[PDB]
């Protein structure tokens, strides 16, 4: 069944439960129509709906698997919608000339999962969850580049081999590439050659219409990613969905020590 | 106004929002509201600080140092006797 760590949302299970989710009105209480609209434009970014899986059966549980564990569920959902594109094409035989259109990157953009109450109400117990938020934007920060695939070099010979970042860390092999050659000397990391991906930062006041009165509202910095970057300006009072994140900050200064109180920001997978 | 009669102070400031109690007694001394015309001048226009305040104060006492001649000599004598 391929258990995956603690998220315990099983591969080769939920993929099929989503695969037969296809072709439904149904219910309601679109779906394949809008996807068939999607395949021509090449715009990708499937916006979904949410709610769909609820109350619909099967995948009554998938809604809870995504809500409680959005991290994996979004990746698996993207894989499955990709392979359902692949299975859409074989139905019509030769399409779009030919296989390259499937290679292009797709993603799911879930939104409106339950109605969350504010930022303020939030428990520290839920740190991987999809969280509605609303408030104006005080500023849109300049774009910071983000590591995706890292590049490396050495004095010998020099050789061009490079390794991807994966998790939020970078480990270069001490020694060495190609071959061999060696020697022990430290790796030379080219700064400019490696790939990058867009990460903005967006400040958000918490619902200035809803306040303790008179205490000034609390800042929520949601960092977005990819296409969403630079898709907005300021002061938009509407709403945003995405996964909550608590990450450690480096304090004083130097020292390589953690302040031990993790700052909190939202991944904001979708905006609407 | 809020302090005197009502007997309480109210702070909605920013802020700490509370009604806290000041039940103090109060004395006040004021000039003749411009122009020494405090003695001869009308029962109104003399006070200079309308209006409800005039009421809030339970007692409004007037102090024109105006003779009252036979009263001046006596005062002087008293002051003299004091200067000791």
From Swiss-Prot, chain A:
Source organism: Saccharomyces cerevisiae (strain ATCC 204508 / S288c) (Baker's yeast)
Subunit structure as annotated in this protein's UniProt entry: Component of the MCM2-7 complex. The complex forms a toroidal hexameric ring with the proposed subunit order MCM2-MCM6-MCM4-MCM7-MCM3-MCM5; loaded onto DNA, forms a head-head double hexamer.
Gene responsible for this protein: MCM4
Entry function: Acts as a component of the MCM2-7 complex (MCM complex) which is the putative replicative helicase essential for 'once per cell cycle' DNA replication initiation and elongation in eukaryotic cells. The active ATPase sites in the MCM2-7 ring are formed through the interaction surfaces of two neighboring subunits such that a critical structure of a conserved arginine finger motif is provided in trans relative to the ATP-binding site of the Walker A box of the adjacent subunit. The six ATPase active sites, however, are likely to contribute differentially to the complex helicase activity.
Shown part of the complete sequence: 177 to 467 of 933
Protein name (record): DNA replication licensing factor MCM4
Miscellaneous: Present with 8800 molecules/cell in log phase SD medium.
Similarity remark: Belongs to the MCM family.
Cell location: Nucleus
Curated annotation (Swiss-Prot), chain B:
Cell compartment(s), UniProt: Nucleus
Lineage top rank: taxon: Eukaryota
Motif Arginine finger per record, residues: 55-58
SUBUNIT field: Component of the MCM2-7 complex. The complex forms a toroidal hexameric ring with the proposed subunit order MCM2-MCM6-MCM4-MCM7-MCM3-MCM5; loaded onto DNA, forms a head-head double hexamer. Interacts with CSM1.
Entry's family note: Belongs to the MCM family.
Note: Present with 35100 molecules/cell in log phase SD medium. Early fractionation of eukaryotic MCM proteins yielded a variety of dimeric, trimeric and tetrameric complexes with unclear biological significance. The MCM2-7 hexamer is the proposed physiological active complex.
Biological role stated in the UniProt entry: Acts as a component of the MCM2-7 complex (MCM complex) which is the putative replicative helicase essential for 'once per cell cycle' DNA replication initiation and elongation in eukaryotic cells. The active ATPase sites in the MCM2-7 ring are formed through the interaction surfaces of two neighboring subunits such that a critical structure of a conserved arginine finger motif is provided in trans relative to the ATP-binding site of the Walker A box of the adjacent subunit. The six ATPase active sites, however, are likely to contribute differentially to the complex helicase activity.
Descriptive protein name: DNA replication licensing factor MCM3
Gene coding for it: MCM3
Residue range from the parent sequence: 487 to 570 of 971
């Amino acid at each position: 069944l391929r258990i995956i760590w603690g998220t315990n949302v099983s591969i080769q299970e939920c993929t099929t439960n989503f695969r037969n989710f296809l072709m439904s009105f149904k219910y309601k209480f679109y779906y394949i129509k809008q996807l068939n609209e999607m395949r021509e434009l090449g715009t990708s970014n499937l916006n979904l709906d949410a709610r769909n899986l609820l109350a619909y059966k099967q995948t009554e549980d998938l809604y809870h698997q995504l809500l409680n564990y959005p991290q994996e569920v979004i990746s698996i959902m993207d894989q499955t919608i990709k392979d359902c594109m692949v299975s859409l094409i074989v139905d019509n035989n030769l399409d779009y000339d030919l296989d390259e259109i499937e290679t292009k990157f797709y993603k799911v953009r879930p939104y409106n999962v339950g109605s969350c109450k504010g930022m303020r109400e939030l428990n520290p117990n839920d740190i991987d969850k999809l969280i509605n938020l609303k408030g104006l934007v005080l500023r849109s920060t300049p774009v910071i580049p983000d590591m995706k695939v890292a590049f490396f070099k050495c004095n010998v010979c020099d050789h061009t081999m490079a390794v991807e970042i994966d998790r939020g860390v970078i480990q270069e092999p001490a020694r060495c590439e190609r071959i061999d050659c060696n020697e022990p000397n430290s790796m030379s990391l080219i700064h400019n050659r490696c790939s990058f991906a867009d990460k903005q930062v967006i400040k958000l006041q918490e619902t200035p219409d809803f306040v303790p009165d008179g205490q000034t509202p609390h800042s929520i910095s949601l960092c977005v990613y990819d296409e969403l970057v630079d898709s907005c300006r300021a002061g938009d009072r509407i709403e945003v969905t995405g996964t909550f994140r608590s990450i450690p900050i480096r304090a004083n200064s130097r020292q390589r020590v953690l302040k031990s109180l993790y700052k909190t920001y939202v991944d904001v997978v979708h905006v609407k | 106004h809020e302090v005197m009669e009502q007997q309480t102070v109210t702070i909605a400031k920013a802020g700490i929002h509370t009604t806290l109690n000041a039940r103090c007694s109060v004395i006040a001394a004021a000039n003749p509201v411009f122009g020494q015309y405090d003695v001869n001048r009308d029962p109104h226009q003399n006070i200079a600080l309308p209006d409800s305040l005039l009421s809030r104060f339970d007692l409004l006492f007037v102090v024109t140092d105006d003779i009252n001649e036979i009263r001046d000599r006596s005062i002087s004598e008293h002051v003299l006797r004091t200067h000791r």
